[PDB]
Write a protein that binds this ligand. Sequence first.
Ligand SMILES: [Zn+2]
Ligand SMILES: [Zn+2]
Ligand SMILES: [Zn+2]
Lengths: 42, 101
Amino acid sequence: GSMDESGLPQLTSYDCEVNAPIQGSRNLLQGEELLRALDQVN
Amino acid sequence: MGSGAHTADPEKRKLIQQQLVLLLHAHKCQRREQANGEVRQCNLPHCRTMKNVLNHMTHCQSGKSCQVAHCASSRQIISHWKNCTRHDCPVCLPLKNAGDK
Ligand SMILES: [Zn+2]
Ligand SMILES: [Zn+2]
Ligand SMILES: [Zn+2]
């Protein structure tokens, strides 16, 4: 059975969506855009 | 459809902030070494780990259906933040209370 191990407190796609959703329609930043985007303070 | 219960625990919002802060950290943390040339791995399991998870996501075009929890999950975290606009952001609010000037 897929029993992947991990130490860092991980969250489920729901635990995130519920606590903070994107409002449908996947976000723009994902891979490299996430770094280019994350660096858009104000 | 899922269970159809619509759960919601604020006690976790704290964990969502740290992950959003560590990601924010790790984001600049990796940019802090470049300024100080070759630097040692800062004493922060969170950052270092995110640096690893970050490298993953950069090649995780799948997202959500990937093979890593911190990948897909982290993708939704940062994604929400930026995509978040004109709403009741419970995470972005406490992290950067900015909306009612
Ligand atoms: Zn760090
Ligand atoms: Zn992945
Ligand atoms: Zn938000």
